Amino acid sequence: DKVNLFILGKDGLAQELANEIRTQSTDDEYALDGKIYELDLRPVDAPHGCFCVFNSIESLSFIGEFIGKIRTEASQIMANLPFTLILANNLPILRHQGQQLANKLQCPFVDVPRKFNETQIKQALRGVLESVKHNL
């Protein structure tokens, strides 16, 4: 019932999302789908899962590039690590490359258009949590 949610982002992007989400913490806990989760949101830079947020070509690449490091690194010791890709608001190229990245990882890809859309945060959140639930 405690989930360690890491959040990757470039240029404070992971921090803004962590902040956005924390403002909704009732009693330092979270209500989703009629349940109450204690989430520990840990934004990062260079039960658990990983939010990956990007808003441009550069941020998308950092995420790719960073997942690659973890990949190569992971080899010398991952398949079930609950990723979820979040695109935060030509837009079409972002979605297409993000969706191929999502496809490669077999992870949900969510678009989040009040800087972030609450309904979309929730979908993203249920993404990671249903994946976490699946791994058990």
Residue numbers in the entry: 594 to 639, 655 to 685, 691 to 702, 710 to 733, 739 to 761
Give the published text:
We obtained crystals of the p190RhoGAP-A and p190RhoGAP-B pG1 domains that diffract to 1.9 and 2.6 Å resolution, respectively. The root mean square deviation (r.m.s.d.) between the two pG1 structures is 1.8 Å over 128 Cαs, and 2.7 Å (135 Cαs) between the prototypical small GTPase H-Ras and p190RhoGAP-A pG1. Crystal structures of pG1 reveal similarities to the Ras-like GTPase superfamily. All five G motifs are degraded in p190RhoGAP pG1. In p190RhoGAP, helix α1 (which follows the P-loop) is extended and sterically occludes the phosphate-binding cavity. Switch I (G2) is completely absent in p190RhoGAP pG1 due to an 11-residue deletion. Switch II (G2) is also degraded in p190RhoGAP pG1, and places a glutamate side chain (Glu636) where the γ-phosphate of GTP binds to canonical small GTPases. The G4 and G5 motifs are disordered in our structures, but their sequence divergence suggests degraded ability to bind guanine base, and in our structures the guanosine-binding site appears to be sterically hindered by the side chains of Glu606 and Arg739, which form a predicted salt bridge with one another. Taken together, these studies establish that the isolated pG1 domain of p190RhoGAP is not a nucleotide-binding domain.
